[PDB]
Write a protein that holds these residues in place. Structure first.
Motif, mmCIF file in Angstrom:
data_model
loop_
_atom_site.group_PDB
_atom_site.id
_atom_site.type_symbol
_atom_site.label_atom_id
_atom_site.label_comp_id
_atom_site.label_asym_id
_atom_site.label_seq_id
_atom_site.Cartn_x
_atom_site.Cartn_y
_atom_site.Cartn_z
ATOM 1 N N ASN A 1 28.416 33.524 29.667
ATOM 2 C CA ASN A 1 28.752 32.944 30.960
ATOM 3 C C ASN A 1 27.553 32.876 31.909
ATOM 4 O O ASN A 1 27.484 31.996 32.766
ATOM 5 N N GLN A 2 26.620 33.812 31.754
ATOM 6 C CA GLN A 2 25.417 33.858 32.582
ATOM 7 C C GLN A 2 24.627 32.553 32.525
ATOM 8 O O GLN A 2 24.071 32.111 33.530
ATOM 9 N N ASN A 3 24.580 31.944 31.345
ATOM 10 C CA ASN A 3 23.845 30.700 31.153
ATOM 11 C C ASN A 3 24.713 29.486 31.458
ATOM 12 O O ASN A 3 24.215 28.460 31.923
ATOM 13 N N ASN A 4 26.011 29.609 31.197
ATOM 14 C CA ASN A 4 26.949 28.518 31.428
ATOM 15 C C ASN A 4 28.136 28.988 32.265
ATOM 16 O O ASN A 4 28.968 29.765 31.799
ATOM 17 N N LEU A 5 28.199 28.504 33.503
ATOM 18 C CA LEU A 5 29.236 28.902 34.453
ATOM 19 C C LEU A 5 30.641 28.636 33.906
ATOM 20 O O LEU A 5 30.974 27.493 33.593
ATOM 21 N N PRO A 6 31.476 29.686 33.797
ATOM 22 C CA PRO A 6 32.884 29.460 33.450
ATOM 23 C C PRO A 6 33.729 29.001 34.642
ATOM 24 O O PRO A 6 33.279 29.121 35.780
ATOM 25 N N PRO A 7 34.939 28.473 34.381
ATOM 26 C CA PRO A 7 35.813 27.984 35.455
ATOM 27 C C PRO A 7 36.334 29.083 36.365
ATOM 28 O O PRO A 7 36.202 28.968 37.583
ATOM 29 N N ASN A 8 36.934 30.121 35.788
ATOM 30 C CA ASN A 8 37.531 31.180 36.591
ATOM 31 C C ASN A 8 37.886 32.408 35.770
ATOM 32 O O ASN A 8 38.135 32.307 34.573
ATOM 33 N N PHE A 9 37.912 33.568 36.417
ATOM 34 C CA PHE A 9 38.443 34.769 35.773
ATOM 35 C C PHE A 9 39.834 35.008 36.328
ATOM 36 O O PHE A 9 40.255 34.319 37.257
ATOM 37 N N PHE A 10 40.556 35.963 35.751
ATOM 38 C CA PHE A 10 41.882 36.301 36.250
ATOM 39 C C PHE A 10 41.972 37.776 36.590
ATOM 40 O O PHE A 10 41.653 38.634 35.768
ATOM 41 N N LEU A 11 42.421 38.057 37.810
ATOM 42 C CA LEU A 11 42.622 39.427 38.255
ATOM 43 C C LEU A 11 44.114 39.689 38.346
ATOM 44 O O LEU A 11 44.803 39.098 39.179
ATOM 45 N N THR A 12 44.606 40.570 37.481
ATOM 46 C CA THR A 12 46.030 40.862 37.411
ATOM 47 C C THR A 12 46.315 42.277 37.890
ATOM 48 O O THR A 12 45.549 43.206 37.614
ATOM 49 N N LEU A 13 47.425 42.426 38.605
ATOM 50 C CA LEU A 13 47.890 43.731 39.053
ATOM 51 C C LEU A 13 49.353 43.895 38.670
ATOM 52 O O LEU A 13 50.190 43.068 39.043
ATOM 53 N N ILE A 14 49.657 44.948 37.915
ATOM 54 C CA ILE A 14 51.025 45.175 37.443
ATOM 55 C C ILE A 14 51.438 46.637 37.606
ATOM 56 O O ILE A 14 50.636 47.538 37.384
ATOM 57 N N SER A 15 52.689 46.872 38.001
ATOM 58 C CA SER A 15 53.183 48.238 38.160
ATOM 59 C C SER A 15 53.338 48.915 36.808
ATOM 60 O O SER A 15 53.722 48.287 35.822
ATOM 61 N N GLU A 16 53.039 50.206 36.779
ATOM 62 C CA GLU A 16 53.083 50.976 35.547
ATOM 63 C C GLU A 16 54.518 51.197 35.062
ATOM 64 O O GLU A 16 54.732 51.479 33.884
ATOM 65 N N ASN A 17 55.497 51.052 35.955
ATOM 66 C CA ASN A 17 56.879 51.391 35.613
ATOM 67 C C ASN A 17 57.956 50.535 36.288
ATOM 68 O O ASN A 17 59.148 50.774 36.084
ATOM 69 N N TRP A 18 57.551 49.548 37.085
ATOM 70 C CA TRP A 18 58.506 48.646 37.734
ATOM 71 C C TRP A 18 58.425 47.238 37.146
ATOM 72 O O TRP A 18 57.339 46.684 36.977
ATOM 73 N N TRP A 19 59.588 46.674 36.833
ATOM 74 C CA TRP A 19 59.672 45.356 36.211
ATOM 75 C C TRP A 19 59.400 44.203 37.171
ATOM 76 O O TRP A 19 59.846 44.213 38.317
ATOM 77 N N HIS A 20 58.669 43.210 36.674
ATOM 78 C CA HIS A 20 58.412 41.968 37.400
ATOM 79 C C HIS A 20 57.777 42.197 38.767
ATOM 80 O O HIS A 20 58.014 41.444 39.711
#
Length: 1850
Positions: free
Chosen positions: A982-1001
């Protein structure tokens, strides 16, 4: 370096790594030619082709393509890139006689580049063993002796269906000791034993009493069924409590003291927690069941002293390193039912005991080891195992039972299946009726669950057939009543009928209430027979006269078959036999098959041996220890095994454990070595640990850590490691799960086949396995559990129970594995799978189901709605909720749950520090109501940064959401080294996800950066130094100058820049590593500036300490050599400072201090008079706001040099930087002389060590780091190289000091580093007691707020060599005590601002590192201890300095407003024009990504600037800071902004003050308003200090408004200012916090009063009265004499007697009066004189030009004359509490009191003994008014003067 493809590191090879066998290894391994000769010839051919080919890499490429057969081209490329390197590298390694020619030959052949590059860089024999052969083949029967012995009186009676072999009850014993009476005990424990029925200890409890209570010996008590273990334990508990109970104090230290109780099952654990809670409540001690089912609930567990738990929870707890912190605290260990050593659990207990006596290390104390056992042979060996002497080894037989137990063995003889049911039933009924017919109650145990009710039915009907009289009642008139009345059933199950026949059923599955009301019936004598599950033997204590065991043959899912009832269960069941007080004898009866007969007898008559089962899990327990770092070679394990029961039992009996040769080995060393290796290599081959078989070295891996820390069997871990792909999807995961070792013997019985197939057909997740296959069964049952289905068969139920029981930890292990490998979807799925595993629900179900308090009917309407669940959350009203769920009633309910559902909102961005590094910044808000009832104390969240695909995981962390951070949104940031792809060729986007360890949805994810970015260009090279043994003091013109530097030679890197400093008058920059000597460099510029007679010189430096030193230093070496006056500066008084500037030739200031003057260069002539400015430690122009100001300063001076044409010389001194070019061009530097060297340019050698530790990134430090540090430290001290340790805080220093004392006092190296005799006198310098006993033992301490004498003493003692171990608080990095070796213990420090731990940064750490210089030839040594998440970053940026970016972007409002204030910037354009002189402007172009620039193009940057300025200007005019006169347009300053610029207060602070201060505001409100200033954000907020603030809030009257967070610093400020006003005694921390606070008050209260006095609000006079209190450190309500220095209560009291109140009376006091009052010492008296003889006295004379003739509303002028009694020599204010300088300033005030209106005001400095000022005011309304004139002092109290008069208005 493993990878699927070639990287640049794999590709390029250095000569030194190209050994004599490199090429063939690489060829053979890369190509895959197992045969030697093939590659042997091939390599020769290749090298020959390289050699003789005088063509090119292309021809070689062709030839290599030919030789390497047109494939494995990367190998050819390896050969190509390293053609000559390998070709000659392989040659040089063959011989030196070849080498000497080869270097010449290689050099002549133009190989010189590769050569410069080159210059630039156990006698073991393994025996294999079968673990199967060692483990016992006899299965369930560990009967090592068929010969059993019965006591006489026993007999066998033969009967048709069975043999009755019975033994009579034992005779009472004749003890030769008198029992201890309850009152014979010590006083403090009398309530530890209830008002008993007998009030005395029994024989068993009496004999053991000596060692159990009065002695502290380890012991093993083997006693029969039901020996009253509780009391036996309590005695020892009470003994342990002794040596912590204070001598005279009738109270008990519940600190530095813990105890632990290990019991087989959780039930008994709970029973004992109950029996130890209320029993020991009187001592104030808290007890607890160790919540081992929570690894988060091990932090809060510390408040409890008594832990009761299972072996496994404890094993996990002790094994995991994070808990090592509190292990030392334990001093008593009671193991209940040790005889489990023979059982499958034994290895665990063995592991624990082994753990105790193994890694004691520094401890040297082993806790009280006490074992409670049943009476079985081999008690002897358990003694040597548990380290028990005969003084504690006790052994009791059946005679000493509190209630003698008779035995009867029923041996059934049937061959038939069903006929055995009647065999048991008839034999049972025989004994049920036998016992009951003898007038007593009975209890019966069954082999299964429902069986208790099936047996109950049979018995009920069997009596109805006949008697139903003996079980009916003991008195129909007073027993069948309750039986028919209250004991008659209210409960709901079939028991309604059963209970009425006088029978009981204690089934583990009935309702709690049913169970209670049920057992209460058997207890009260109503029910004549109680049938129950095994659980009753473990839980509730409900004795009975006769006990009967039916079944015995029980099912065990672990083995997928049946086995005989375990001995412990039998014993425990018989543990309920008899009633001591009521019965003379009890009785036990067993129903079993004749195949069993002797076994249960061997159990119940002291024949069953205790053998070790350790081997079975040896591989697992070994792995755990290797992970702990307790094993690094075989002999470590060899020694580790010596503390096991196995070892002792092998010694005692080698023929049963199958040891071949004890003859030779007698200690079993060789055997242990063999076994150790044999397990270790299994761990090797399974990739758990890494092991060098030959050379003996062991290193645990990730898998091993996961294996040990999550308590997983090695086999399962292997399966997971090998089966688990990165491409694995949901369907495979279940199969992977099924294949686990835990489901090894899961037999698919055909009986079950039909019922299973019914499920398998209709499973929601495909199963490729056939119905006749275990994997399918497991998968089905788990997926069934996820739908919580019901099964009728016992066999199925036990299995699914087992499954769902282990599924949790198995799945968690799987998840951790998938995460450590960085595989997205596997972890992503597995988390939700674990959640489904615990919550019994699929992701397709609605999370409202998850609440324990939820609407039943509502959810099913949502599950079948097809409506997205996430759409319900934004229903911000109970109405829409009620609509959504189709119900008013339940709407109001569920509405609260939606608002209480864990949900967040996040946003983030990317920030490229450098080409290869991307910084991620996130901001998150948690949005819900923390209903403690469901949420608990904590909600963890998985943070995961991943790629475009969602496949590979880039970064991951765990966020911990607590109650008091919800709603309080906050930020977080982290580093990712950018992927080379990626350093040489710019990617479109990364994804940052946050999810509860024990709660659904709860899951929420968002993209990062994307919108396009320009990565900074890779850094240009530094400027290395050409050879210098040059420059001397004699190159200096004046010989006087040569006597300054002393050392005739100039330092290496220092000499280089000399020419452009001492001679040249050009602008010059020097970036040199910290510790190289820039301090001395600075002096040359001055010397040149001086010898040429230039003018005033300004030295800038944010480092206060260095300024303070340099002032005291320079005027001792420079002042008298050329006629110069040197003086520093306290910004707290700008007016003083201005004069100090005017009155001195050269001065020292911090950036803000001088900036405060320069920000009005337009008027202050003496600014542009400057010609030389030195900018030391300039690198901190990026160090936040103060740095932004620092930037603004030099920017100004440039702007001044430009605008006033007269040039100014800039001498910038900094540490190592990145691209100095920008910094150079910025400062108008001559590009010739902008020197910039790299960190690795040190004049001395520095060797930096850095070590990563796991699970510390969220805490200060841990034990391993401490041990490591002290080892390194003492090792350093051993070699005459004193060591300095840096710690986060004083608390840590103290703790580590104690740690030093214990550490040292238990080993060889332990000295003071000096005599124990000569050092004693300095112990008499205790100006701070804390330092007494620590320093007494050879450890120096240093902290912020330390007394001067202490710091002198300790530092000088350190330098004298009186102590080699120095402990320094981070805060005292300023106190640069340079040393031979430096250590950094921890890199995290907690901050309440961001509500978490914050890490050290490059500057702090570097400043710490700089303190290293080994004695002459010795290398300076540095040890940095930190976490895994940080090591890379530190090692990265310490060698490659971090880019200096501009923080200026945050202070735009302030600087812009200020520049507008001086009418320098008048138009919008002028803003951008001004920006051109800043580092920000030159730096935003070279990295527009970092600063949020919308368009990378220069155009875009100009746009960014325009938009920026526009927004800022609108923001300024919004709050009336400026006014934009429209049309070019023109801008001019207004009141608020003018104030801000005048005093130097932040825009937002002003804004806050304006919208908070009111005409109705009072003193308190003004204090509170003051405390909210932005300037206080830099004030510390230590972890848990709030608790201290609450304690102070009870000593102080004013109450902090409750409608604002007390977790804020404003609270701390608000209280501490009161504490300051009250002169209240404070802690060492708060006083420093206080000083820091006070530093920033003076120009703030002025802003308050000036805001107030602008609106004409007379309340200004209040804010003034506040200002006085701040200067004299006292409430303005006290005796006017209290503000006087050192006027204690005694003097204050005496002053009442002589009728003295005002200060004036004190100076007017006669001498003979002072002698009897002023008992103070000369210094204090001098201070009193200093205060008193400067206390001002003024006379006020108003003179209105005309006292009547004023026009209405006309601006009438009034002249006010102020006169002074004497001419003041110095306006220097005196105060023992305010630690700075300040002018005596006065407020002139004119206002109408009746209207609360201030007509006029003027701030003045009363320097001359007489002067007058003109004021002008608006003539008020027509009529007559009462005007009042005040003249008040802002620095003293009670010297204020006032006048009043009448005016008439037309």
């Amino acid at each position: 370096k493993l990878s699927d493809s070639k990287t640049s590191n794999i590709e390029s090879v250095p000569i030194y790594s190209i050994d004599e066998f490199f090429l063939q290894r690489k060829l053979r391994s890369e190509l895959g030619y197992k045969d030697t000769s093939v590659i042997q010839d091939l390599s020769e051919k290749i090298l020959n082709d390289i050699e003789t080919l005088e063509h090119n890499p292309v021809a070689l490429e062709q030839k290599l393509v030919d030789l390497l057969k047109f494939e494995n081209i990367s190998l050819a490329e390896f050969i190509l890139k390293n053609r000559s390197t390998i070709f000659w590298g392989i040659r040089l390694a063959k011989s030196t006689e070849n080498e000497i020619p080869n270097l010449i030959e290689k050099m002549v052949a133009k190989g010189l580049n590769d050569l410069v590059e080159q210059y630039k860089f156990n006698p073991a024999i393994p025996p294999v063993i079968d673990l199967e052969k060692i483990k016992f083949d006899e299965s369930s029967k560990l009967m090592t002796v068929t010969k059993v012995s019965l006591p006489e009186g026993s007999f066998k009676r033969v009967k048709p269906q069975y043999d009755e072999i019975h033994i009579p009850a034992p005779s009472k014993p004749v003890i030769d000791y008198e029992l201890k009476e309850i009152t014979s005990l010590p006083d403090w424990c009398q309530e530890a034993f209830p008002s008993s029925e007998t009030t005395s200890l029994n024989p068993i409890q009496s004999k053991v009493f000596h060692a159990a209570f009065e002695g502290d010996s380890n012991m093993l008590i083997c006693a029969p069924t039901g020996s009253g273990k509780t009391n036996i334990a309590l005695l020892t508990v009470l003994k342990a409590l002794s040596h912590h109970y204070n001598p005279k104090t009738k109270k008990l230290n519940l600190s530095a003291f813990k105890i632990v109780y290990i019991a087989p099952l959780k039930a008994l654990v709970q029973e004992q927690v109950r029996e130890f809670q209320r029993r020991l409540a009187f001592l104030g001690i808290k007890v607890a069941e160790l919540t081992g089912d929570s690894r988060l609930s091990r932090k809060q567990i510390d408040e409890t002293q008594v832990l009761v738990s299972t072996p496994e929870k404890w094993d996990i707890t002790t094994r995991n390193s994070n808990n090592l912190a509190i292990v030392e605290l334990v001093r008593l260990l009671i193991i209940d039912e040790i005889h489990l050593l023979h059982d499958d659990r034994g290895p665990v207990l063995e592991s624990i005991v082994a753990r105790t006596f193994w890694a004691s290390k520094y401890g040297q104390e082993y806790p009280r080891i006490i074992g409670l056992s049943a009476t079985l042979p081999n008690y002897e060996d358990v003694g040597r195992f548990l380290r028990v002497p005969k003084e504690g080894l006790f052994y009791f037989d059946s005679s000493f039972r509190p209630c003698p137990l008779s035995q009867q063995f029923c041996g059934i003889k049937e061959r038939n299946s069903l006929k055995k049911l009647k065999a048991m039933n008839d034999a049972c009924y025989e004994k049920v009726l036998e016992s009951i017919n003898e007038g007593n109650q009975i209890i019966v145990f069954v082999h299964s669950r429902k069986e208790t009710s099936r047996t109950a039915t049979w018995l009920k009907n069997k009596f109805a057939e006949e008697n139903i009289t003996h079980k009916l009642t003991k008195n129909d008139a007073g027993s069948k009543q309750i039986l028919k009345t209250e004991a008659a059933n209210v409960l709901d199950p079939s028991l309604r009928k059963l209970i009425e026949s006088g029978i009981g059923t204690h089934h583990a599955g009935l309702t709690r209430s049913d169970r209670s009301l049920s057992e209460d019936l058997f207890a009260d004598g109503l029910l004549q027979v109680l049938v129950c599950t095994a659980t009753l033997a473990w839980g509730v204590n409900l004795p009975a006269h006769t006990v009967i065991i039916k079944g015995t043959d029980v099912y065990s899912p672990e083995k997928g078959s049946w086995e005989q009832l375990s001995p412990q269960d039998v014993l425990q069941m018989l543990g309920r036999a008899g009633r001591p007080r009521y019965d003379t004898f009890g009785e036990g009866i067993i129903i079993t098959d004749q195949s069993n007969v002797q076994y249960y007898l061997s159990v119940l008559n002291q024949q069953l041996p205790i053998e070790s089962q350790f081997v079975s899990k040896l591989v697992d327990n070994l792995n755990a220890e290797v992970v702990a770092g307790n094993i690094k070679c075989r002999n470590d394990a060899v020694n580790w095994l010596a503390y096991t029961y196995l070892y002792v039992r092998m010694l005692a009996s080698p023929m049963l454990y199958k040891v071949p040769d004890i003859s030779s080995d007698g200690q079993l060393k060789k055997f242990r070595e063999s076994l150790v290796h044999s397990a270790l290599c299994i761990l090797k081959e399974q990739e758990l640990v890494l092991y060098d078989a030959e050379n003996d070295v062991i290193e645990a891996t990730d898998l091993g850590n996961i294996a040990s820390s999550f308590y997983i069997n090695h086999a399962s871990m292997d399966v997971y490691n090998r089966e688990l792909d990165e491409h694995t999807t949901q369907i495979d995961l279940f199969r992977i799960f099924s294949m686990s070792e835990e489901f090894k013997y899961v037999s698919v019985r055909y009986e079950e086949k039909r019922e299973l197939k019914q499920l398998l057909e209709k499973a929601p997740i495909p199963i490729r396995e056939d119905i006749d296959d275990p994997l399918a069964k497991v998968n089905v049952l788990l997926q069934s559990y996820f739908s919580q289905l019901k099964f009728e068969g016992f066999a199925l139920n036990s299995d699914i129970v087992f499954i769902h029981q282990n599924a949790g930890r198995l799945l968690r292990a799987m998840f951790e594995i998938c995460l450590k490998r960085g595989w997205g979807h596997p972890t992503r799925m597995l988390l939700n799978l674990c959640k489904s595993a615990t919550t019994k629900m699929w992701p397709t179900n609605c999370p409202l189901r998850q609440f324990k308090t939820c609407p039943v009917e509502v959810i099913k309407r949502l599950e079948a709605s097809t409506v997205p669940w996430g759409d319900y959350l934004q229903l911000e009203t109970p109405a829409e909720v009620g609509r959504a769920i189709r119900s008013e009633k339940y709407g109001k309910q569920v509405y609260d749950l939606l608002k209480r559902f864990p949900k967040m909102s996040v946003t983030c961005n990317a920030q490229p520090i450098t080409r290869s590094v991307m910084r991620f910044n996130i901001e998150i808000i948690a949005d819900w109501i923390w209903d403690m009832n469901v949420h608990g104390s904590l909600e963890p969240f998985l943070l995961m940064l991943e790629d475009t695909d969602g496949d590979s995981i880039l970064y991951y962390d765990v966020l911990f959401i607590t109650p008091d951070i919800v709603g309080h949104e906050f930020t977080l940031s982290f580093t990712y080294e950018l992927k080379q792809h990626n350093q040489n060729n710019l990617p479109p986007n990364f994804f940052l996800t946050l999810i509860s360890e024990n709660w659904w949805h709860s899951e929420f994810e968002i993209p990062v950066s994307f919108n396009g970015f320009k990565l900074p260009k890779k850094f240009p090279p530094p400027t290395p130094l050409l050879e210098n043994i040059s420059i001397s003091t004699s190159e200096l013109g004046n010989d006087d100058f040569s006597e300054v530097f002393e050392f005739k030679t100039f330092n290496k890197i220092q000499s280089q820049v000399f020419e452009s400093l001492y001679n040249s008058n050009d602008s010059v920059f020097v970036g040199s590593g910290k510790g190289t000597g820039k301090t001395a460099m600075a002096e040359l510029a001055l010397l040149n500036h001086w010898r040429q007679n230039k003018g005033r010189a300004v030295y800038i430096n944010p480092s206060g300490e260095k300024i303070d030193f340099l002032l005291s230093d320079w005027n001792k070496r420079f002042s008298h050599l050329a006629g110069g006056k040197i003086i520093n500066k306290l910004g707290n008084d700008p007016s003083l400072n201005l004069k100090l500037l005017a009155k001195s030739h050269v001065l020292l200031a911090t950036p803000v201090q001088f900036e405060l003057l320069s920000r009005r260069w337009r008027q202050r002539k003496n600014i542009q008079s400057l010609e030389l400015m030195i900018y030391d430690d300039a690198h901190e122009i990026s160090q936040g706001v103060y740095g932004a100001v620092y930037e603004t300063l030099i920017s100004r001076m440039i702007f001044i040099a430009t605008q006033l044409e007269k040039k100014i010389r800039f001498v910038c001194l900094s540490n190592c930087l990145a691209n100095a070019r920008d910094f150079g061009e910025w400062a108008g530097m001559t590009k010739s002389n902008i020197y910039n060297f790299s960190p690795s340019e040190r004049i001395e050698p520095l060797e930096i060590n850095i070590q990563s530790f796991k699970d510390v990134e969220h805490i200060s430090f841990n034990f391993s780091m401490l041990q490591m540090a002290f080892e390194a430290s003492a090792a350093a001290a051993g070699n005459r190289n004193s060591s300095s340790v840096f710690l986060p805080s004083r608390k840590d220093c103290m703790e580590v000091a104690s740690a030093f004392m214990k550490f040292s006092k238990a080993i060889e190296w332990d000295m003071l580093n000096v005599e124990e005799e000569q050092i004693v006198p300095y112990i008499e310098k205790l100006t701070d007691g804390h330092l007494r006993a620590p320093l007494k033992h050879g450890v120096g301490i240093l902290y912020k707020g330390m007394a001067s004498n202490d710091e002198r003493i300790v530092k000088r003692l350190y330098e004298y060599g009186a102590v080699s171990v120095l402990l320094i608080s981070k805060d005292c990095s300023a106190f640069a005590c340079k040393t031979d070796e430096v250590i950094i213990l921890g890199t995290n420090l907690y901050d309440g601002a961001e509500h978490k731990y914050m890490p050290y940064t490059i500057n702090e750490l570097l400043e710490m590192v700089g303190l290293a210089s080994g004695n002459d030839s010795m290398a300076g040594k540095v040890l940095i201890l930190t976490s895994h998440n940080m090591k890379a970053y530190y090692k990265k940026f310490l060698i490659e300095p971090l880019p200096t970016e501009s923080y200026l972007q945050y202070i735009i409002h302030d600087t812009l407003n200020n520049e507008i204030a001086n009418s320098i910037i008048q138009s919008k354009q002028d803003c951008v024009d001004w920006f051109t002189y800043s580092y920000f402007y030159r730096r935003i172009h070279v990295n527009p990504s970092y600063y949020g620039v919308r368009d990378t193009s220069p155009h875009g940057i100009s746009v960014f600037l325009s938009n920026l300025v526009e927004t800022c200007l609108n923001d300024l005019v919004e709050s009336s800071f400026i006014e934009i006169d429209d049309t070019t347009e023109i801008i001019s300053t207004l009141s608020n902004g003018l104030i801000a610029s005048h005093y130097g207060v932040s825009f937002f602070t002003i804004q806050s003050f304006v919208s908070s201060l009111s005409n109705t505001s009072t003193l308190k409100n003004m204090l509170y308003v003051l405390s909210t200033a932005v300037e206080f954000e830099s004030v510390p907020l230590r972890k848990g200090d709030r608790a201290l603030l609450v304690k102070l809030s009870k000593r102080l009257p004013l109450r902090f408004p409750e409608h604002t967070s007390s977790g804020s610093v404003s609270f701390k400020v608000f209280l501490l200012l009161q504490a300051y006003f009250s002169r209240l005694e404070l802690p060492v921390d708060f006083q420093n916090d206080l000083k820091d606070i006070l530093e920033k008050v003076v120009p703030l209260i002025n802003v308050v009063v000036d805001i107030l006095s602008a609106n004409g609000y007379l309340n200004a006079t209040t804010a003034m009265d506040l200002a006085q209190m701040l200067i004299q450190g006292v409430w303005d309500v006290d005796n006017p004499l209290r503000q006087i220095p050192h006027f204690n209560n005694k003097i204050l009291e005496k002053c009442k007697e002589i009728n003295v109140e005002t200060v004036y009376d004190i100076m007017a006091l006669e001498d003979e009066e002072r002698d009897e009052i002023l008992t103070l010492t000369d210094s204090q008296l001098a201070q009193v004189a200093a205060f008193v003889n400067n206390y001002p006295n003024v006379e006020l004379t108003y003179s209105l030009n005309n006292s009547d003739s004023l026009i209405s509303g006309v601006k009438q002028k009034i002249t006010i004359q102020l006169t002074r009694d004497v001419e003041p020599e110095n306006l220097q204010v005196t105060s023992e509490k305010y630690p700075f300088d300040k002018l005596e300033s006065w407020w002139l005030v004119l206002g109408e009191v009746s209207k609360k209106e201030l007509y006029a005001i003027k701030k003045v400095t009363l320097n001359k003994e007489t002067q007058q000022y003109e004021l002008e005011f608006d003539t008020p309304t027509s009529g007559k008014h009462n005007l009042t004139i005040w003249c008040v002092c802002d620095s003293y109290l009670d010297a204020d003067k006032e006048l009043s008069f009448e005016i008439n208005v037309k």
